[PDB]
Design a protein around this ligand. Structure first.
Ligand SMILES: [Cl-]
Length: 428
């Protein structure tokens, strides 16, 4: 009975991973993570259910994988070993990452490997990163670094952010994912060439499962799934920019605490996720209650007088009222969307209408239907929205010109800020 046959016979694919937003994360609304979604899709390919198991550290992860009755594979952003070990075999690679030395804005930036000597350094125990430093230590014997089995990457970066350690070493993708929480964290330099991440399978001569893993990852590439997952989880710096990333971190730390209870209160009484509402707040005003503009919108949630009057907001500059009014407006808009639009798209459609109004959004949907696209599918209607800004298209619509390009930007950003806030984890 082959490894694949055991999986098929048991009707379950058991996957071991790390506990973190990058790989696998549990939230009241559900389960997320780059590896989680990639493994989920693989389980569906095999016609079996996914069963996630977590490891406390990398040594434990590899120990579980090689134990009798262990999981089928490990999907945890793993870097294959410098040299082969009979205990583990790796799939083809599915994401190129660059190891980076991370330092604290305020202290001097080490520029080369030799500068790592005489520094307080911590890395994950059992990691490829620890091995890079072990290899380096042969060349510079005075190099010191600590290995912890009790920390995750988020903790290492937190330690650098607050000055508990001088430096750490992590993969570029997880740095990008975490830059939005740690305002003082900075890349010092790229330490070594880019490496491929791969899934790990148990040792031995059985290729039944391995060949399906490699066929799947090929299909995952061709369909764009790897790029789309990469962009959601590891695209914060790409999309927001580097200054935007650590600037958000600064605001998360300094601004959000003044308004968090207002968001939670509105979210609770409106029975809707408070972090989605806070994400709207950030896109609108960067959580600034005195924010204004010359386009007739004002306050933390940037309400028009029209909207403010309808929602019963008597002071747009008051943060509590602004948050409540805009939150109420968002929920009302979402409720009034045509019944044919189902979640999760319904919420993204609601953000579009929050920004551009339901009338203009209806024009975008009608255009989608004419092009033979699904008007109830957000990714289709998202293609049509920019056309409302073009006179070649808007002149024949019922409601005419609208800034649908800016609407697409608004929805993408809020969704990202919503992810970011959902993935916050508390200090140790
Ligand atoms: Cl989007």
């Amino acid at each position: 009975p082959t490894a694949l046959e055991r999986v098929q016979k048991e009707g379950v694919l058991r996957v071991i991973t790390r506990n973190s937003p990058a790989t696998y994360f549990q939230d009241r609304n559900g389960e997320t993570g780059f590896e989680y979604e990639l493994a989920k899709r693989f389980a569906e390919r095999l016609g079996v259910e996914l069963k996630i198991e977590t490891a406390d550290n990398l040594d434990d992860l590899y120990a579980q994988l090689s134990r009798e009755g262990g999981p089928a594979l490990a999907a945890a952003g793993l870097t294959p070993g410098r040299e082969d070990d009979a205990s583990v075999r790796y799939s083809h690679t599915y994401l190129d990452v660059t190891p980076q030395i991370i330092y604290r804005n305020g202290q001097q930036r080490p520029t080369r490997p030799e500068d790592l000597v005489g520094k307080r350094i911590m890395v994950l125990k059992g990691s490829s990163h620890a091995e890079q430093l072990a290899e380096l230590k042969k060349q510079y014997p005075e190099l010191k670094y600590e290995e912890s089995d009790a920390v995750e990457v988020v903790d290492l970066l937190r330690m650098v952010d607050v000055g508990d350690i001088d430096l750490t070493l992590v993969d570029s993708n997880e740095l990008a994912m975490n830059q939005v929480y740690f305002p003082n964290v900075r890349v010092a330099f790229d330490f070594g060439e880019a490496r491929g991440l791969a899934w790990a399978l148990p040792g031995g001569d059985d290729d039944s499962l391995m060949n399906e893993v490699n066929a799947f990852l090929d299909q995952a590439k061709k369909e764009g799934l790897l790029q789309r997952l990469k962009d959601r989880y590891y695209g914060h710096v790409d999309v927001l920019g580097y200054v935007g990333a650590y600037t958000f971190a600064q605001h998360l730390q300094q601004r959000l605490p003044r308004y968090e209870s207002h968001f939670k209160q509105s979210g609770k009484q409106l029975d809707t996720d408070w972090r989605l509402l806070a994400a709207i707040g950030y896109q609108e005003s960067l959580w600034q209650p005195g924010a204004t503009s010359k386009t007739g919108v004002r306050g933390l949630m940037m309400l028009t007088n029209r909207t403010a009057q309808a929602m019963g907001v008597s002071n747009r500059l008051d943060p509590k009222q602004s948050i409540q009014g805009g939150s109420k407006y968002f929920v009302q808009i979402r409720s009034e969307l045509p019944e044919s639009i189902k979640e999760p798209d319904r919420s993204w459609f609601a953000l579009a209408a929050y920004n551009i109004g339901g009338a203009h959004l209806e024009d975008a949907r009608k255009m989608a239907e004419k092009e033979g696209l699904n008007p109830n599918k957000w990714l289709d209607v998202k293609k049509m929205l920019p056309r409302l800004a073009q006179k070649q298209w808007y002149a024949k619509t019922r409601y005419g010109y609208a800034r649908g390009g800016e609407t697409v930007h608004f929805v993408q950003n809020v969704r990202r800020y919503y992810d970011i806030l959902t993935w916050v984890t508390q200090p140790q």
